[PDB]
Every structure is written in C-alpha cells, then in structure tokens.
Design a protein around this ligand. Structure first.
Ligand SMILES: Nc1ncnc2c1ncn2[C@@H]1O[C@H](COP(=O)(O)CP(=O)(O)OP(=O)(O)O)[C@@H](O)[C@H]1O
Ligand SMILES: [Mn+2]
Ligand SMILES: [Mn+2]
Ligand code: NA
Length: 359
C-alpha cells in the first residue's frame, strides 16, 4: 500500500511514467498561473505519486490502489493511454498566457507579477522586452537578460563540481573549519540543474564570524572579477521561536543569490568554445552548527518531498518541522539532531536517501 506522503515513498530519477507526469506537471503549472491553488496541489500530488512507481502505467487497471488519483486526474491518464498524448496539457502548451508566463519567468529576476504586467502590455517575446526604450528593469532582471543564454542552458555535474571547488576554496580562506555541502537537485542525483546550492556551517565560528563569512567570500570573488551578480539576505533566524506552521515554510538563515563567472579551464569534463567562461547561478546558505541537519534536509528538497515531510510531521506526529528546527507539541520539547537520519528517526519514518527524494 503506497502512502499518500512523499516522505514515505522512495522516488528515484528512473521515472517510468514521464508521459503522464509531464502532462500533470504542465496542468499544475497552469493552475499556479491561474491562481487555482487547490487544483495545482491535486495535480502536484498525483504527479508525485506516479513518479514513485517502479513500473509504467499501461492500463487504467494499473492505477488501482494508488492514492492521490482523483476522477479529474484519472480522466487525464485515460486520455494519454488512448493515443499517447494529453489533449488538456496540449491546450495549455498552446495557450498564449501560459507561453508568455513560461518565457518571461525564464529570465532571472522576473516573477509572476512582472510576467503578468508585460503580457497585459502586449509583449510576447524577450527580444521586444529587452529592446523597449520605455521599460525599466531591476538590477536582478538586467543580470537575467545579460547572462540569459548561459543561465537557460543546463548546469551539468562537471560545472557543479567546479563551482563546489571555488566555494570551498573561498570559504576555508576565512573559516578553515567550515563544512560546505552541495544541496538541491545535484545532491538528489540529478545530472543537470538551473543552479548550484550549498550549505555552509562552522562548528567553532562565533555569531559575528557566521554573519561576516558570506560578505567576505563575495568581496573576495568581486576582487577576483568573478562576481557577476550578488544579493545577500541578512538572517532573521530566532534561536527559540517555534517552527513554521505554513504549508510552504520560509527560511530565515543568512543567504545569498549569486551569479558567478566560471572559467572553462576549471571544468574537467569530456569537452575555448566561445568567450571561455559560463555564468552560473549559485545559492549559498549559512546556518548555526546545531541546526545543520534541519537546514541540510530543507535545502536538499525536492519541494514536494519537503511539503509532505512537514505535513506528515504536523498531521501524523503532532510535530512542527522547518529548515531550522523540530518541535514536539506533546512532549513540549525541541528535538535535537546531528544528522538527517536522526530527524527521520524522531518522526518515526524509515530513512529516505537524498537520491530517493525526487518527489
Ligand atoms: N533561492 C532559494 N531560495 C530558497 N530556497 C532555496 C533556494 N534555492 C534552493 N533552495 C532550497 O533547496 C532546495 C533546492 O531548491 P531550488 O534551488 O529552487 C532548485 P532544485 O530542487 O535544487 O533543482 P534545480 O535548481 O537543480 O533545477 C529546495 O528544497 C529549497 O527549499
Ligand atoms: Mn537548485
Ligand atoms: Mn537554488
Ligand atoms: Na524568473
């Protein structure tokens, strides 16, 4: 019996149901754009459970006993079994609002509100947006347009590893005892990603040393001429506050959203070609040493795995979980963890490996 929770499922990158899940992911994305949160959630949960299957669905009988598959979802599956296509997802892919939203938000610095604004102004192409003499762009959007081709091309594993070397070299220069971990999609085993994320923590650093590290590391890269974009968000972390009750929990740790210049010579791949460097989106998070397991768990993802982990903790265990802590409402105590395994054990869950969290 397959659980309704992604945190009680093993979801690996060998997806046998991409025909169904690609269609469900498109329908969920459209519901997000149309502000239909409920329908979005139902399609995301259906897509997630099909991603966990160890075999491809080839008939409607194969869907028996699978949770999170409502009547609307089963109609979509039936249509794909019929002729190998989803008429519903095909209509979304041909919709002008959907096409514009996907295209505009593919730019770093452009979200739902700016994409909607440009659509209602009559824009349909990035060429017309960039060349417009009346539009005003944020510093984030300027970087998004300037490095667009590099950012839209996938970051591969040799590039992610080359970035990891740069991050570690910079970090240990100021904090030699610091632990640097690659998180996000690449930690879940992905071959490619839109960015490279890292968790940084130090067992001996002070509160001030912890606060200054991201400033020191980015100033060092600025001096090197490697910092193409930088936004540092100061910490709002509260050591003794209860974890978030929200569906999508906010992270209060100090973090930075960067664009780094990655020289081709630093990349050890099978394959200078052009300008000799590639712009790479990099996110760095700094957390207190005692919260490193909660931060690692939250930053590893996937987003669906994190949502279900927090939902299971609340509804099944009367626990409150987020990127900073785990609180037991029955025992009235915060639960400590030195590893992700200890968090799973506190929750009464079998340990799910990072490459099994692709929900
Ligand atoms: N810029 C950011 N802001 C907030 N959280 C982020 C973040 N980047 C990464 N994370 C966190 O770490 C996980 C990775 O998030 P994302 O970076 O948005 C992409 P991904 O799941 O890593 O695959 P991809 O970036 O390789 O395509 C998420 O669970 C999220 O909570
Ligand atoms: Mn990522
Ligand atoms: Mn990221
Ligand atoms: Na965007």
């Amino acid at each position: 019996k397959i659980s309704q929770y992604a945190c009680q499922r093993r979801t690996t990158l060998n997806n046998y149901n991409q025909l169904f899940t690609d269609a469900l992911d498109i329908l969920a994305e459209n519901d997000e754009l149309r502000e239909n949160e409920g329908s979005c959630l139902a399609f995301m949960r259906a897509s997630s459970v099909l991603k966990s299957l160890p075999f491809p669905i080839t008939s409607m009988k194969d869907t028996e006993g699978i949770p999170c598959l409502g009547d609307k979802v089963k109609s979509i599956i039936e249509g794909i079994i019929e002729d190998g296509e989803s008429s519903e997802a095909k209509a979304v892919l041909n919709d002008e609002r959907y096409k514009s939203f996907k295209l505009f938000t593919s730019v770093f610095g452009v979200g739902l509100k700016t994409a909607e604004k440009w659509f209602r102004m009559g824009f349909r192409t990035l060429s017309k947006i960039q060349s417009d003499k009346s539009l005003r762009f944020t510093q984030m959007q300027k970087a998004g347009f300037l490095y667009y081709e590099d950012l839209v091309s996938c970051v591969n594993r040799p590039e992610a590893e080359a970035v990891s070397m740069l991050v570690k070299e910079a970090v240990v220069t100021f904090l030699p005892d610091a632990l640097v971990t690659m998180t996000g999609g690449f930690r879940r085993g992905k071959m490619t990603g839109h960015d490279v994320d890292f968790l940084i923590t130090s067992p001996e650093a002070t509160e001030d040393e912890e606060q200054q590290l991201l400033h020191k590391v980015t100033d060092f890269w600025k001096q090197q001429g490697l910092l193409l974009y930088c936004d540092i968000l100061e910490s709002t972390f509260e050591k003794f506050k209860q974890p978030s009750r929200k569906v999508d929990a906010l992270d209060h740790f100090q973090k930075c959203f960067l664009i780094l210049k990655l020289d081709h010579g630093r990349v050890h791949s099978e394959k200078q070609e052009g300008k000799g460097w590639k712009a790479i989106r990099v996110d760095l998070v700094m957390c207190p040493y005692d919260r490193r397991a909660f931060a690692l768990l939250g930053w590893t993802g996937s987003r669906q795995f994190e949502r279900d982990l927090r939902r299971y903790a609340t509804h099944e265990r009367k626990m409150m979980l987020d990127n900073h802590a785990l609180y037991d409402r029955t025992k009235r105590v915060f639960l400590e963890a030195e590893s992700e395994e200890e968090i799973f054990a506190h929750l009464g869950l079998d340990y799910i490996e990072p490459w099994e969290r692709n929900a």
